[PDB]
Amino acid sequence: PVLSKDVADIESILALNPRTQSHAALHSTLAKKLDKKHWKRNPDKNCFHCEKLENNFDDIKHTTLGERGALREAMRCLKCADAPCQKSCPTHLDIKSFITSISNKNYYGAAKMIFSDNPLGLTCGMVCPTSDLCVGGCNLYATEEGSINIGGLQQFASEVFKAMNIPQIRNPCLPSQEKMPEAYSAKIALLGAGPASISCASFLARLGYSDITIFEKQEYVGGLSTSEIPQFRLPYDVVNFEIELMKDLGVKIICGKSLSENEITLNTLKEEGYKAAFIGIGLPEPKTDDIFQGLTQDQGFYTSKDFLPLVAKSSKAGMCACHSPLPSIRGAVIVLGAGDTAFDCATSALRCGARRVFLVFRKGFVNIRAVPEEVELAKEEKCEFLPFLSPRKVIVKGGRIVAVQFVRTEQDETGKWNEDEDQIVHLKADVVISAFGSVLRDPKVKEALSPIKFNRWDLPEVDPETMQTSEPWVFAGGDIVGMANTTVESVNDGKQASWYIHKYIQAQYGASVSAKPELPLFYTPVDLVDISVEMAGLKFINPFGLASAAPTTSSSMIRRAFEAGWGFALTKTFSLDKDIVTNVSPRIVRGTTSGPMYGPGQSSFLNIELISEKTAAYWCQSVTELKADFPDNIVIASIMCSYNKNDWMELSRKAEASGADALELNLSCPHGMGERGMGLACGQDPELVRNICRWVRQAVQIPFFAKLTPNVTDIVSIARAAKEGGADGVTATNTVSGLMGLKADGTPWPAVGAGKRTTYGGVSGTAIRPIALRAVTTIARALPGFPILATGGIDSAESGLQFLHSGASVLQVCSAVQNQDFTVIQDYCTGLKALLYLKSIEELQGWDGQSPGTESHQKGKPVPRIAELMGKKLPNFGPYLEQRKKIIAEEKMRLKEQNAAFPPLERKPFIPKKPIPAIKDVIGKALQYLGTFGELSNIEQVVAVIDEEMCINCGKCYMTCNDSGYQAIQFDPETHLPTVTDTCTGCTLCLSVCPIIDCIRMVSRTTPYEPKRGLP
Amino acid sequence: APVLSKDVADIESILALNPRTQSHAALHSTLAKKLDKKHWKRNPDKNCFHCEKLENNFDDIKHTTLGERGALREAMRCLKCADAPCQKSCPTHLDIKSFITSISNKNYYGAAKMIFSDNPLGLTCGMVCPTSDLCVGGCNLYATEEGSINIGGLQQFASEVFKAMNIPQIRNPCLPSQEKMPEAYSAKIALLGAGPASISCASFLARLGYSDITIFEKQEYVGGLSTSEIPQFRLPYDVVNFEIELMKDLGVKIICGKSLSENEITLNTLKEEGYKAAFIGIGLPEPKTDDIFQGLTQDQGFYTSKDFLPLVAKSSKAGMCACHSPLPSIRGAVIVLGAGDTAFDCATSALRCGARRVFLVFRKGFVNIRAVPEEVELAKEEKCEFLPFLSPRKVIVKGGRIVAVQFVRTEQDETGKWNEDEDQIVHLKADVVISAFGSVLRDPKVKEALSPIKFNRWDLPEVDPETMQTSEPWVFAGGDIVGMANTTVESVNDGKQASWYIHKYIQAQYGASVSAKPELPLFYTPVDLVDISVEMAGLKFINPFGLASAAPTTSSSMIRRAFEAGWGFALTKTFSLDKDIVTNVSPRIVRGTTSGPMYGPGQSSFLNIELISEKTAAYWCQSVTELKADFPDNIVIASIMCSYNKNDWMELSRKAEASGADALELNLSCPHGMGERGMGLACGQDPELVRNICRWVRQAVQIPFFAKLTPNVTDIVSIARAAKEGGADGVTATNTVSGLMGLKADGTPWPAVGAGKRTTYGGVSGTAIRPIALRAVTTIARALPGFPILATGGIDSAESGLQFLHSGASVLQVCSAVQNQDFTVIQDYCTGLKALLYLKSIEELQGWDGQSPGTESHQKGKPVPRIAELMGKKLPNFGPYLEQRKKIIAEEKMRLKEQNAAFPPLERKPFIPKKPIPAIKDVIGKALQYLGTFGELSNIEQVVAVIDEEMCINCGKCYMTCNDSGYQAIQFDPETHLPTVTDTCTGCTLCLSVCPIIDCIRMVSRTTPYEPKRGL
């Protein structure tokens, strides 16, 4: 047969494979009109009908992220200096740092940074109106691709930490309870269990106060987060999660107790010995209108204060002991107002079975104060909007509302608003929901706050800086003060109040506090993990250090690195005065190794930089200064001489004498003849390496390490030469010999001088990580126990741990700091603590480090595991999507009677059930899996299998198998769903190109396997 | 000395905004946060009730416009899907996959050629297509959190680049010379109306070869609604002109001032004058009117959209008219009636005329608005008001001017039927009224001129919807006039569809048949005539691109399909003698981690542990015979491997020669000896072994052969020299780099084979190893000038291919870019290389880098206003500074108004090549002269960085990179977040390398005295 031609069966499987076309395509406009609907993904502009949402409380947020999408967005963030997003965050979150942590896969460290400044961090990630806060200031707004989804990233990192089931601990900088001064046992009362009080009580507990009680009126906790924000924006178990973190600190909550003239008053608090009080009861009553007096819920009328708690009680499992039904909202619904509560009323009414929702407001569209986040949800659910209408009268017939009459408004000269008596609208309705805002009106509650001063807004007056009322021992914050409009501002009110309550209580016991306010960070048991390590007789407080390179250009930069937390540092390579050099410029350029992606996260750099331009006298004085001020931080002096015994002995002794803990020998100097085509660098010839090491070993008594080039046939040869010469370890590796490319006219970059000259340079960064990782592993297997200092693409705790697993003991970093700044050390440390701690948790063994097992999702939202949706060839577009939504909707209806909510889950943390590993316990554990090719099994073959529910129908697996594989994948012409057939060889290309993490998995082959031989 | 390792006061203060690690939570009162948010605001303010001023401001407001930086990033993101649904959803069926692929590869000519092949109005459409209802509505990436691709903006960018290139369209180069075309092609063809439908029809007819095509246009201007009504701030008029001149390149004639009308042009007069075919493309020329508006005049303030929008167009589009038109003075309140897309253009255009307020008033509800959300968003963002459920009834006129319009309320019932309530009236004040009720064909003289064709119930010409033929077989019709098309792209498609069947009709009238499958020609320019052949080692290649010996050449049927796609040459997968049969393991090919957790397209590397071909030598030898029989012009090179055995290498090389291989490639990867005498394990790492193998093969075969080198050697030049001494005719540089691609957090590797989860060192391929392959190719070409080089290692575009040619290679092998995609990238590489060579002959484009225009100062890809008071004033694009920029820009627009001069739109004439177009032999090795030793690099010509404040996006990355990786030389202003490079810059170039805006930072000659920093 013709071996170079596909048989019919294979020609058929390739039917959809791309081919170069030779003509323009003919398709009629009508034919295209009919075919458009088959593929449609987004809303149809011609559809006027709301999709049925009855009793559907699934997440409708556009900002929710799964891990794949979060990692992408986190790498996109520029991680800016003095970031404007943080300035625009009411709780001043270090967004630069937590997003950096996410891009580094360090989700614990992101959450810790988030909850450090905001103890309701998962709530706020979900509900902050970020367009009017952090996101509104994002520098990436000045790009076509737009601002960063800060809220969703906050939500993602915080969800992962929640799944970790790790508890908050007592501030570990505090003395033992025993030894705490008596002022910290002061009895503290907080009123109302909402965001304001939860924040305040948390920070007070962080400071060490041991007798903190929140008195809550209702039998549920969390305030409006629980009673009114919809389940389909904020799930109740988020609220429960953040309450339990606060309770880990010892804060008490007593439900069913009210601030009210006949119960809790300031007077009674004072009679019972309380030393300070925080008022965070919010705005508990609806703003009402005379037009609606006497209307009952059963006639069809609700305020937002009546309607939203009813819906929350029915849909939020565990909110109440009573299971309660969903309100019977049938027919046409009018929502009054254009604030953000009105839009939640409109969307919640759809969940209760409304046929039609009208939002009616008295001003225009240009006057809607609602954030567009919120407006879009109502718009995409086909609510109707009516402006310039003021209510005048509700029509009641036969005991139920039948219509509302309105008058038109308009804006005049002044801009003052008028009402047009002659211009009326008679709007039919069966239900009316007023969303006019909220107030504090109840005289009995107001009297319980006597005698604090109220302002003309009829709310307690406070000092905006301290949150103190006119009674020095009473503070207030949140909605009740009237400045906060958002959850995060109310959190910030309690946070601000916490410092000044603390100041007040200490002063009542005769003790002062610092004039600089200093609230503690957030802590868990992860932060107590020991990540020190011992290497070549030296003690490293953590395994991360700065490589000899541009971040160590000046010893003042090493100083700031140590102040930030880096365990050790290398001096930039320096030489004797005879060998002074002068750098050229330009000399450091971005790598082209991952295409034209500019800004953060460059996948490589190339440099043509020489040794330090600073003298040996400078570096030696500097090393002495650094070791004087930072005795616990390791300083290694990097030095270079030419091939000359007296110079190497002179320079090493000079550096030893200065107080270096150790030396690093830079083997990059060129030698004599070249001789046997064995490179021009000293470090390429094992005989020169061995001699150089022998010289230094004679001269000094401190440890010294030889820094090895990867640009050799066998690096194990030069490693063993170094050991044979006396070295105490090796550093693996320096940069890879390379050229970063040319402009289109042929001129290089870097291009030096008018002649546009370059020379070969050194490639660094994550593009050389496979090379340095191979070098470390290969030295670690050939020279067991020989200390290795790893260098090459280390940019995270996770990548660092790969190098530790491969035999290295400590971790040098250059390019990752070039891509950022010194503060990445805090990410690296908390990340490594979290990775070691997680090894002790049985319940998380299925995770890969800090990543949960990937489950079936679309757009990071869990696929409904319904019977009728699965196995049934329904991709997420076109008429198949319509059928999916019809299936989901009927199940939600079946879910309204098949009605359970009585198996929640006490949230108890995972306890370590094995000891937490130290660095010495993990070093070199990967080597057991490394071997020759003959040691790999060829009996145990795998095949690919595709999860249809996670597929996004791109066909890349199909194109890759067609033009780089075995033509083993069927791609359906109607559903664009792939299926791996039995001809799969398990090569694993398809999985490698798929854009959805874990959509394709390799599994053990169960059918007989036969290699394809072409001919017998 | 002082303290050398501490920053002096002046440095300390430069470092003021440098990130530092945090030990405490930050206290900031909520009030202070409210008062600081305003300073950093980038995006719209929900509290802003007030449109900025836009009178006489016709700048681009499109959300989708892209600069190169943004376009590359979005093109890189596209999944480049098989059987793409975006293309399914495009009415002209553009190959979106291909053209976006070309954009990601920097091949803007290829992208534009692919666009205009199927859409002769490709630039217009990229600007104005309602993509959310078309191609973007079907995009698979809608199913990710980051959302669908900006297809229109990508199409705009590539077409805009091609426009600047000033390359003309050429006559279809497959046609015979005009002199020997059949007589049928000289048939006189008439088209009526010079809008999109006729421009597209005439273009495609001219492509087919017809030489006598005339468009008769009623007005004095050409372009249809693209000219007369679509606003300048969405579609600049020079776009329309550019597309018209592309038509005229094909010889189509346009005659203005003559109408399809009684007493002018009629089908009867066309027939009598010998016209053989006619296409009616006159659109809908008249406004749909309402009896309520009878008698009202422009003087009173009434317009239809057909009156108003051409008035604004005439005044704002330079080159429409000879009449410098005064902008209609539209002061006060404007009512626009309707909610189709024309209404929204009237709204935004009214503001440009000085309207104080605009009311869009429509007779149904919001859910019933038919306009695409992109069009609505523009009016809503500019603060137009929207009034639903109003039907107009009376227009009140006082003092010769409209003073008000009064309406009645509309309503729906059960039946879905729309009623008007007489008792529910709105009296709205207004000075100007513009009806946007749609357009119609109503002139009796025009319809009469179409006699006797049949008209349907909507009084429109009936067509067969597949052929666009009217009831008269020689008369065709398309566009708005047929009532099917709603868009520019569908109108273009109507003319495209009609052109095939006009061709069929005309050829039949001259007694000739046409093919049963429609074959419209593609779009061609002189670039397509560029020769990209190359000779090397006695072999002729039709282009320099080939498939490397790898997974894309797993089977010979795959090679066959690659040759059918256009590939110049191909390597077999390495094969060997039967006794050397192997068996692959699995998994064995995985994705690179070299650029972080980015999944899907454009993987920066792969790692493989694959062996030689599992298929026999007999299969490969037979396959090479069949491929050479069927593709005599494509080079087939057999890749072969034996152990270090003379008889084996002679036997296998003779077998491959006898099969018909053009040449052989010796895979020097086999082991021999134990391996680390400085020369490792594989034969390719020892020069003596390479010399001997090449001697053996040279004795055995007379066809050329090349040794494939491994980069895993101390000195790759010595291996190339040894091969050359042994008789090789060239070297392939290089194979994969040995590496280990990473470990999971538990220490297991990937790939992991078997239950033991074992692995071995693999080979790294793709763009992450390009610097290594580029260096190897460069060092060989300089050490052994003229010795042929086949380059491999990360080649993924014509641009990167030319880098390797410039560096001394003659041909280019690809593997990983195909694994990332499919075989059809070859068409991108060929057109890209043609364009790069063509442009080297164009004097006017000498400032570009290849196909990249020089970067002009921009924000979000829109050129910043060159206004004096806007420049150097320290006005970043946020906060109170943005608001000042907006005032200054609007004042300048106003000064440009009261002087109404300047109407000189440059006439368009193509750039002529001034020297011959370079061949491949012209460019080979031409960059090598820029390489040198370090000692030939000048240290007297230093540079410094300089920042363009107008392009900056205020991230401070330059600042943090210079602070923690440089010389603390940048001042970052704490209020404006603008950086300034100071005189302490060393030109190291790190800041430029990390900046996210292409060319925002430039390295310029240093003009101040330079002292290296010696610290001493």
Ligand code: SF4
């Ligand atoms: S594992 Fe390889 S052979 Fe199997 S379907 Fe994927 S690409 Fe094809």
Ligand code: SF4
């Ligand atoms: S890195 Fe570029 S965009 Fe960012 S502040 Fe510096 S110059 Fe501006």
